[PDB]
């Protein structure tokens, strides 16, 4: 009947949350109602499962706010947002060593995230592969795609575009797509190989170079010429700053496209991805749609259409304020935190490390499991529950394929999670151990994977 | 000085009392150095002044008005992840409410389990693809069950938005677009049926044609699909592209039978960020029920609370638009939207009557609620020459601040030059008065300067 | 060599040093962001159903508090309007509690930082009235006692700090409060006063002053000993006058010489606001009032604190002006509707005995319950409380004192902000928590730490 | 009935009864949004290259302006600190312009709303000094003239409003400004003063007071007629002293008895700020100063305005403080670099003859050019000005005056905020414009409306 906030007749959001509302309500009442329910969302600061930016910068807030109505697709009405977007394509291209374009503009596009960028990469792969077969007179009805432990976007790609996903299974000692097994899976129907440069599940890089040598030898051995698209969702904004010596990008001739998330280590806010092609030949013109506007026409290869230009603008702000110099410092701060956690956690239990936050191996992450046949009086699921009681989300989950038996804990170190917070995590980690040791009945109870995808 | 011109990272800047960087000198490479955060902010902030504010842009369909409450909701929601149900369960709850509300708005059958089948999207584009994929899979599953080949799917439609051209190309479906032609601009029952066959995955009426403003009416088409099924056994479904009309007809013309009232309408899509009133980045698609949505398309993710299924092309993205959409549903309801959309219609209808007095025009859309969306669309009467083309008028208007797009139609009507005026929230009766004044002044200018006729020759952006 | 990813710069750690005064300056905006970022480790309280303290947010209150950051409550001279506003508040609370009309037009009483200070002042005033009364009768004054029920911690502190024997009537099953019989058994010539709790912290039930009052009248008739009351209305003092005005508990009772309440509980003020009113000048021994000099003459204060900001007063004013009786009535009843609804709904979900069910004629908007004796549903209320934390709620489980030492209660406080839709959400998480304990029996009996119960 | 899509309510037109004082109240917040929505139709001026006035945005300035919306410039008594700040600005502007050190510590001068008011004050003071002396000689004083070049409109207003005959030396081919020869032709015993324009509005070029000063010396030598100067330094006044300290144009010349300049042009103040400085008490007739009583004594003002806000002065002081000569020199150099660059690039694009090219020793940060005589590249600068409008730029084309009624010029003003990158964008758009004019020859000769040239 009454609401204590408004000292008035009560408006429930839960009653008839099932139909379109009939009546108007005071604007500021609707606002305070929604505002209040939003407090029940987490703030992610103690969420150690996600890669997506959760820190807050006033300049980014002001820039998102100015841009709320700036339509990324409408080049004609917001020509300056359009110009900023083209800068960022060129800069990401450059970051990844794309060849100098003949026309002065890199081939590539901002996206909403890595998912769309993957679809575009995938569709391009499929189309280059179909042209090759059609020219060579071969059937094109059985495409396949060869990969390791990919993010879920490759599952959707395969499904939505009717391509056979040839996923190399995780297995003990080999948690990733190695050159030998990659090669066993390739044949004239392979549209491409997708190395994951920063595997979501573990944190490690699949290194494109040895896979690239193996594809070169494959072409020599069989005449079959297979290309790569690097899914660098996390890695593409790490390695180029802290390890330029890792050759994973367009310096490799088979690498025809690359995609990354701006809203992970690109430090952009949620809703920003990037995909770059090596050159015009890498992007079939059949996929590009040309629309007229007053200043000529512009080509777009996008799944999305209208949407706000703010994230692109924020991405640019990050590029401008940091440069290589700043990015290197920012990403090193995160690697330092991971290395530290890895180092410290190692002393607390009988653990085996899959990833220890090393810049030459992968991304700022710690991934570990219990040592085989070692029982410290808890599972990592249990430990994950204790940590949620201290406000932390530290996902515990299983690996796939032939490692379906392995439970790992993954910690992600993203911007905002500084050394002080890592210290606090550790105190909570220790207090959890002691608790588990004081209450042995807790062992084995917990059994539900935390969300592992982003 | 002896510092030669090309060895400097040059230039004082009058704003910083300092040397600076030229965003344009080195926009081809990743920047080398850090720069004070607030300087980079000011740099970008100043360049953003070169954008329009769209208040005077009469071409777009997208929300360009500003409401403080929306600004605040968006700004709280910058990091809220629409895909992460675990961390943001309240944003997830609000999203599910919106899906039930839009479902209900479209007469979706009551769900056995209380939750409508549908999803927020980034826009009509994603929503279309999901609708299109689902159509393809339903059709495929049916032909497989029947032992028939599935390698030549086609889609039958009228003058569709570009997202259907993208869907047809991206998913290898032949687009059977009924051509606009003089005197029949739209997919009619007859030409629709000529185009239909066992390989048709669906028909897509466009309930609010992008190019003109008009509704294609699903009812008569629905009638022709019923008879087509009786004559041939072939059972074809519909997905209605209601990008704009989806949030207009339910309030100002609830009697147009276009939605899930029609048994063949298996899914409907619409754009929140057009007449939905939401800010940029929001779309909706709804399915009649679980049968309408092949489970194979839905991905189940593990989370701590069990698992939830999503059908999306995107993945992580912010939840602010959904929240803001919710805010519009709550503060307006059916009563409020009815008033809001009526205001734009009055504005469109007003401009149609007044523009008709000013030249020899033939109208394709006059902002009548029973006919289409709040838009005015016209051409010159055939064989009449008033001393200018609509392209010329569109240029003069631009000199006075307005974007009023002139472009050609498609198909057999590619000779036809139209002007379209979109009336959306914020474009009020007083601003339309101002437009008219400007339009009269442009006509006089053109009448005083006849060497202008025929010079402007470029289409304005038409798609949104 | 350590970097910070926020600042793109050498790391500054609040934990390094943290035990020595820092040596070096650091940039203001960096120190600010450092601290701000750490504040995200605090809760929001929106989901913390243990506390009584205001946790909602109103832009106007934020504005007034911010205006007031430097307004010194004690400094009447520099901030005369803050002073005038405080004085209006004292009059309005006195009137709320049916204080007798004052001869000089100003009610007797004061703002405080909380109930705690207001209890100290009321306590001291009790002790001094009894002392003076006994001195004037030539009698020893070194053994003063105080009679009370299951009192808030401030009374324990008062007793210890001021050397008064606390005669606390213990809780016992059946009777979790101070009843007249046990009250009188404890009373004597050295009893400085009785302190009923009009809203017992641990349960949410009102101790009713009236029957106790009648027992003190009879006690006087029988023995000549004339004992007064101070009502601790921490919570009930801003509830009953709006939703149950016929409960006679306040200055309508002759023996009630002073009353206290928390403005930052149900008075709707922000943290840092309590009130104490005395019946009239006689109820407040002048010896306790300090008169300072200022330019317009002198003002007397009775305070433990001295300089402090005037914003909470000013905010409390805003609440009084914007709502009035009519507004308070709607605001408090809405919380009662929440509490009554939860009592009903929770009752359906397991074998519970209720102590408090949000009825306005019985207590404050709280739900307080225990498991039915014997009936073992497969968890303790500790366990249930732990499950509820994993879904973000703090719903405290704790033991009663005294002779009710076996009893484990759960207490849910319904405060402004915690509306019907949030109650529904708690109910859903409650059910889901029960489902989990059923599916995971091993969990039973594990948790055993009482949650914070005091405020 | 008519609805508004913003408010979901009956429509309220600002246009309907816009000729009658409105009858009824409406909600405040609706009136605000209605007005705020109309204001979107104003330009923002960032792409307007015709104006000299500040169009950039500095948060600190906005904050000071907003703090000062009610500070009354004239009310020294209630706003004594705004007054003190004002007086500092007067001394600082006097010092910048080499005013002789004040015998009393305070320079003779005042803030004004703009150059306009400042010119009247200067104009009036010339008038009175001239009048006093001619009245001493028992000579008629009813026909004063004022000798000048291509002055800003304020001199035309002064002339008209004070019945002074305006002897404006016309612009003519090859001599667009007041030279010594023609100046002297126009001088006689009725000349109240000569006004060099130190930054001509129409072109950007400086009129140099030193060679004019020499001629006036010779004139007094030859004829016994002693003529003074007032420098209209609207724009030059905050440019030259920082980037061309060697140009002698100010109080270093004995005949210069006052100077005016706009704070809200290159002084960097927001709109509503001007300055006029007199050499010393003798240059300012006392009869023109009004003495107004108040608590701390009385102050004299020479003003046309009276009550008005102090914010622009406050903002002016802010710029003086944060910049100094060091900061100003950088700011203005920056604008010059942009003007000079545009002059250089623009000369590459067509058959142009430049009047001004952004050289700090010649004039202000401006580019001014015309088509080479008898050359036809296929458009007029009016045509070019139209194409550039379609790209969002206001780049005014207009005819010169007097004997160059024939010459059409394009003038580009480079003020703070129009940085090198925006100059690059204009050039890109300039070339896009030349290309289009080329591809559509029928455009040639269509456009013929002068753009606003005055500020």
From Swiss-Prot, chain A:
It catalyses: L-glutamate + H(+) = 4-aminobutanoate + CO2. Keywords: Acetylation, Cytoplasm, Decarboxylase, Lyase, Membrane, Pyridoxal phosphate. Its cofactor is pyridoxal 5'-phosphate. InterPro entries: Glutamate_decarboxylase, PyrdxlP-dep_de-COase, PyrdxlP-dep_Trfase, PyrdxlP-dep_Trfase_major, Pyridoxal-P_BS. GO terms for molecular function: glutamate decarboxylase activity; pyridoxal phosphate binding. It is found in: Cytoplasm; Membrane. Induction: By acidic conditions. Expression is regulated by a complex system involving RpoS, cAMP, CRP, EvgAS, H-NS, GadE, GadW and GadX. The level of involvement for each regulator varies depending upon the growth phase and the medium. GO terms for biological process: glutamate catabolic process; intracellular pH elevation. The keyword Cytoplasm applies. Converts glutamate to gamma-aminobutyrate (GABA), consuming one intracellular proton in the reaction. The gad system helps to maintain a near-neutral intracellular pH when cells are exposed to extremely acidic conditions. The ability to survive transit through the acidic conditions of the stomach is essential for successful colonization of the mammalian host by commensal and pathogenic bacteria. This is Glutamate decarboxylase beta. It comes from Escherichia coli (strain K12).
């Amino acid at each position: 009947l009454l609401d204590s906030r408004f000292g008035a007749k009560s408006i429930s959001t839960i009653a008839e949350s099932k139909r379109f509302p009939l009546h108007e309500m005071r604007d500021d009442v609707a606002f305070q109602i929604i505002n209040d329910e939003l407090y029940l969302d987490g703030n992610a600061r103690q969420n150690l499962a996600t890669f997506c930016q959760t820190w807050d910068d006033e300049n980014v807030h002001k820039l998102m706010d100015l841009s709320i109505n700036k339509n990324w697709i409408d080049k004609e009405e917001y020509p300056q947002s359009a110009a900023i977007d083209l800068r960022c394509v060129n800069m990401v291209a450059d970051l990844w060593h794309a060849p100098a374009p003949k026309n002065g503009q890199a081939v590539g596009t901002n996206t909403i995230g890595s998912s769309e960028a993957c679809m575009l990469g995938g569709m391009a792969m499929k189309w280059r592969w179909r042209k090759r077969m059609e020219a060579a007179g071969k059937p094109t009805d059985k495409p396949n795609l060869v990969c390791g432990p990919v993010q879920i976007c490759w599952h959707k790609f395969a499904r939505y575009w009717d391509v056979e996903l040839r996923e190399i299974p995780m297995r003990p000692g080999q948690l990733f797509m190695d050159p030998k097994r990659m090669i066993e899976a390739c044949d004239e129907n392979t549209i491409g190989v997708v190395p994951t440069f920063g595997v979501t599940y573990t944190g490690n890089y699949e290194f494109p170079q040895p896979l690239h040598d193996a594809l070169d030898k494959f072409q020599a051995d069989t005449g079959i010429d297979i290309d790569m698209h690097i899914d660098a969702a996390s890695g593409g904004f790490l390695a180029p700053f802290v390890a330029p010596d890792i050759v994973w990008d367009f310096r490799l001739p088979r690498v025809k496209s690359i995609s990354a998330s701006g809203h992970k280590f690109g430090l952009a806010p949620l809703g920003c991805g990037w995909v770059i092609w090596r050159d015009e030949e890498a992007l079939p013109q059949e996929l590009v749609f040309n629309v007229d506007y007053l200043g000529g026409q512009i080509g777009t290869f996008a799944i999305n259409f209208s949407r706000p230009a703010g994230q692109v603008i924020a991405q640019y702000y990050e590029f401008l304020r940091l440069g290589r110099e700043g990015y290197t410092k920012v990403q090193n701060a995160s690697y330092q935190v991971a290395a530290y956690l890895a180092d410290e956690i190692a002393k607390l239990g009988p653990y085996e490390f899959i990833c220890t936050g090393r810049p030459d191996e992968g991304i700022p992450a710690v991934c570990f499991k219990l040592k085989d046949g070692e029982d410290p009086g808890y599972t990592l699921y249990d430990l994950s529950e204790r940590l949620r009681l201290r406000g932390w989300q530290v996902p515990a989950f299983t690996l796939g394929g032939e490692a379906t038996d392995i439970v790992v804990m993954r910690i992600m170190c993203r911007r905002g999670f500084e050394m002080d917070f890592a210290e606090l995590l550790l105190e909570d980690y220790k207090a959890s151990l002691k608790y588990l040791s004081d209450h042995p009945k807790l062992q084995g109870i917990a059994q539900q994977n935390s969300f592992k995808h982003t």
